[PDB]
Amino acid sequence: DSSSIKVLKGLDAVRKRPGMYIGDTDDGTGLHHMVFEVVDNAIDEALAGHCKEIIVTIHADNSVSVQDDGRGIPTGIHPEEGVSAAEVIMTVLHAVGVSVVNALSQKLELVIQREGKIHRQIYEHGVPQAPLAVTGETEKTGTMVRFWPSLETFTNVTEFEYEILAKRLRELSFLNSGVSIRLRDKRDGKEDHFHYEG
Numbered sequence: 704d705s706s707s708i709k710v711l712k713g714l715d716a717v718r719k720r721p722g723m724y725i726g727d728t729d730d731g732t733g734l735h736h737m738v739f740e741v742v743d744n745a746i747d748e749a750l751a752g753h754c755k756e757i758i759v760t761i762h763a764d765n766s767v768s769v770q771d772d773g774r775g776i777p778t779g780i781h782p783e784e785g786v787s788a789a790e791v792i793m794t795v796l797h798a799v800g801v802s803v804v805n806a807l808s809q810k811l812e813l814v815i816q817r818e819g820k821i822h823r824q825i826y827e828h829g830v831p832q833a834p835l836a837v838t839g840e841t842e843k844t845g846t847m848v849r850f851w852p853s854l855e856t857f858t859n860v861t862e863f864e865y866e867i868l869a870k871r872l873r874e875l876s877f878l879n880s881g882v883s884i885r886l887r888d889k890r891d892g893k894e895d896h897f898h899y900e901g
């Protein structure tokens with residue numbers, strides 16, 4: 704309705720002044736902050752007792768993905784906005800927030816494994832191609848977000864550096880005692896694993 708309007712309004716505002724939300728867009732700090740934001744979302748689910756392992760993969764097409772084995776974002780339709788709760792999370796300001804990463808991603812794939820099913824939604828610059836759809840069956844739970852940073856927004860440093868993710872992810876495992884985080888670089892086979900048990 705007009706909610707499709709306000710979503711676009713907020714998305715506009717983020718793409719207009721990206722540094723204000725994500726960090727400096729010209730020296731790689733914001734670019735990498737895109738990842739830690741998605742990861743911080745998964746860490747929350749781990750701090751609530753539902754996530755154990757987080758898997759961050761740097762893909763060959765210069766996208767990153769974050770996988771967890773938590774509950775899966777709720778997939779039920781929201782009363783105020785008439786779309787899945789998941790889509791509200793990914794698109795509404797203050798639902799930072801992941802919506803910022805979505806708004807500043809040329810493309811974003813969401814995959815949720817929940818109550819026996821696998822749901823999927825693709826976004827372009829924060830805009831869904833379609834409503835969250837059920838794609839298939841599954842016996843595991845979790846959320847997977849894969850994003851391709853918007854090349855309009857990020858300048859100079861537009862490729863992820865393994866060592867920056869590696870350092871910060873170790874730190875984040877230490878800051879949230881008990882979480883396991885794995886980092887895979889599919890470009891050259893680099894791999895690492897972080898976990899501080901208390």
Ligand SMILES: CN(Cc1ccccc1NC(=O)c1cc2ccccc2[nH]c1=O)C1CCCCC1
Nearest residue numbers: 741744745748773774775776777792801846848
């Ligand atoms: C509604 N969720 C919490 C919640 C409630 C019930 C079941 C699963 C969750 N999980 C989540 O929302 C959730 C969101 C998420 C987003 C990006 C990447 C990984 C993610 N992993 C998650 O687990 C969050 C949404 C963002 C703000 C806090 C509440």
